[PDB]
């Protein structure tokens, strides 16, 4: 607690990060306020948040945060022409005024798609106006995502500024900067889907779940502390993402601030990895425990045969803190394992689980629990051959054909999803491969495990929204344990009827020659998932003739001069010679 809280924070940050923290936080409440009026505000709230640090018995200064940004949201002239219920909020007080607020923020605020400028535009924008060309862009993206923890937007924008500062001085801007863009995109975007995710599991599953997959991870990430102080962290990182999901910034950024300075204090007791990030300013210290790489786990561990198969008071511990026993169960395993997911971790401790709910009460239970370890074998080989499988197809083929095998695939097994929804899971999970395969087999089902659950959850919303199967419902909202596992017994559908024939579909033009290499592949994806959609008894070497002899006719029809007839000519004899090739 201090005298003056706007004081305190604007010392703690720098005035830099202030204004633009302040930026992103009304941005995301005054969503349908103009750029200019946000600069406004902020310039404000920042000179008075000087007149704080000069003298925090100053006039004000006093107040809480809070109440700080009540009241400023209250002094907006327009607020109830374009809020409207959110202008009788400021009829409230403190602390009902603060919650009100929250709850007239809008998570799908009805805003045109933000396109993307000219490299050139951009960079010459970034040159002439850095400030202004930032600030507008970072307003534009904060009124877009209300919802989207703060500081990691701040943090997510000084690596856009980076982008900017190199590549705009580059020999070809372009080949620079679009990358960079293109991967703090998804970036940007795989970390909402983190944090949703995290959310929605809390609320369904509940706190207990989550807690189990709390233990597993935080007893990868620090091995070498004890139980009693990952299940201390386990039960603050609970708190904190419990007040996150609610909503309010400041609670939820005091929560998160709290619990890495208790970190900070204690590393001895956690990790040997969080030097450097414990001397990061408040502003980055919980980002940086967060990413930090697991530490060495203890040299001779022994097995777990010891506490939980060999014991004679098995039952006994378990039975007094089922969930504790569990959670030791976990930590053990988890410590031992930092190249498992935590999902298949979590499928481990489950059955453990239910093998002493039947055990424990059984005539003797160490007969019956004897051998529950190797019922593990199964359930870590699965995930395993998976990525073996699918790394060895990603160095056969390529990123663009393993793309294109894996759109085959899912086409068959679900032919009822939209044909644009199937090319972007396809090429995304096909960027999975790329960096995931690309690590030893050590790391690569963490990595597996980190983005595809990305895919799974943008696919399932999009599938709440509007539905297309039975069975991908079934997947989407079963135990997030067993997400994975549903969606990969996914069986080809065999009740599917095929579409019709159309035409058009499968008629290419001139412009396929005069498009980028990412619209020609999009554009020849939409097709290959077509062509499943149409004859979904074709097999992959049927469709290999078919899709070789595509290649080579746009490769004819484009070295002649008489293009576009081509296109239609010999268009006209490859679809015809590929119907009969088919059905
Ligand atoms: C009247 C001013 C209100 C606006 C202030 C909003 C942002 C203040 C501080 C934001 C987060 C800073 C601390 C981050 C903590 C963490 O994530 O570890
Ligand atoms: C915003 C993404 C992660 C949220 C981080 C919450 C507070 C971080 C403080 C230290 C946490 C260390 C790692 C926690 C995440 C994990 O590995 O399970
Ligand atoms: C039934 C699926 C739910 C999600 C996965 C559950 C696996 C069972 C393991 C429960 C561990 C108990 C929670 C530990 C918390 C603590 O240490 O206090
Ligand atoms: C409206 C969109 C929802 C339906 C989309 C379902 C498409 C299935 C693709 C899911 C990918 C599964 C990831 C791993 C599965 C496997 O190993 O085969
Ligand atoms: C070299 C790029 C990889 C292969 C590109 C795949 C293109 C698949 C679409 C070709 C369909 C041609 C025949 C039409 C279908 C029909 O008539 O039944
Ligand atoms: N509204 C409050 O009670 C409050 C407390 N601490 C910081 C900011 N706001
Ligand atoms: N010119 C603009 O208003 C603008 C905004 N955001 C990005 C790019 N340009
Ligand atoms: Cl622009
Ligand atoms: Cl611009
Ligand atoms: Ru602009
Ligand atoms: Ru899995």
Known sequence: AHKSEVAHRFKDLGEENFKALVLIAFAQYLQQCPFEDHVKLVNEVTEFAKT?????SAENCDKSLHTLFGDKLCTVATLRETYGEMADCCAKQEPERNECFLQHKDDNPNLPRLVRPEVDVMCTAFHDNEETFLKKYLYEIARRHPYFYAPELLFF???????????????????????????????????????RLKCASLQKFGERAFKAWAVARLSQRFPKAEFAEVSKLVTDLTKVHTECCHGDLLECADDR??????????????????????????????????????????????????????????????????????????????????????????????????????????????????????????????????????????????????????????????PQVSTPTLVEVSRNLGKVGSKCCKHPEAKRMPCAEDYLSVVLNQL????????????????????????????????????????????????????????????????????????????????????????????????????????????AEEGKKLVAASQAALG
Do not use: W
Request: with cysteine; charged share 35%.
């Open 52 to 56: 704080c640090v000069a003298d925090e």
């Open 257 to 414: 601030a709290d619990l890495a300075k208790y970190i900070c204090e204690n590393q001895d007791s956690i990790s040997s990895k969080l030097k450097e990030c414990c001397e990061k300013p408040l502003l980055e210290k919980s980002h940086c425990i967060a990413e930090v790489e697991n530490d060495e786990m203890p040299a001779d561990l022994p097995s777990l045969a010891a506490d939980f198969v060999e014991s004679k008071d098995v039952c006994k511990n378990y039975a007094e803190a089922k969930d504790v026993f569990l959670g030791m169960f976990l930590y053990e395993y988890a410590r031992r394992h930092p190249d498992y997911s935590v999902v298949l971790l979590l499928r481990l401790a489950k059955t453990y689980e239910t093998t002493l709910e039947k055990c424990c009460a059984a005539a003797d239970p160490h007969e019956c629990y004897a051998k529950v370890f190797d019922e593990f074998k199964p359930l870590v080989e699965e995930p395993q051959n998976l990525i073996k499988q699918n790394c060895e197809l990603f160095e056969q083929l390529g990123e663009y054909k393993f793309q294109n095998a894996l759109l085959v695939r899912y086409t068959k097994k679900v």
């Open 460 to 567: 399932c919303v999009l599938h709440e929204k509007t539905p297309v199967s039975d069975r991908v419902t079934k997947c989407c909202t079963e135990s997030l344990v067993n997400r994975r596992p549903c969606f990969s017994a996914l069986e080809v559908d065999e009740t599917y009827v095929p579409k019709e024939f159309n035409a058009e579909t499968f008629t290419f033009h001139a412009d396929i020659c005069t498009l980028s290499e990412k619209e020609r592949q999009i554009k020849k994806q939409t097709a290959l998932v077509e062509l499943v959609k149409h004859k979904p008894k074709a097999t992959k070497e049927q469709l290999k003739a078919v899709m070789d002899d595509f290649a080579a006719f746009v490769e004819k029809c484009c070295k002649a001069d008489d293009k576009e007839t081509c296109f």
């Open 157 to 195: 924008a000084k690596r856009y500024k980076a982008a900017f500062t190199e590549c705009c001085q580059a020999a070809d801007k372009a080949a620079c900067l679009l990358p960079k863009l293109d991967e703090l995109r998804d970036e940007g975007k795989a970390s909402s889907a983190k944090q």
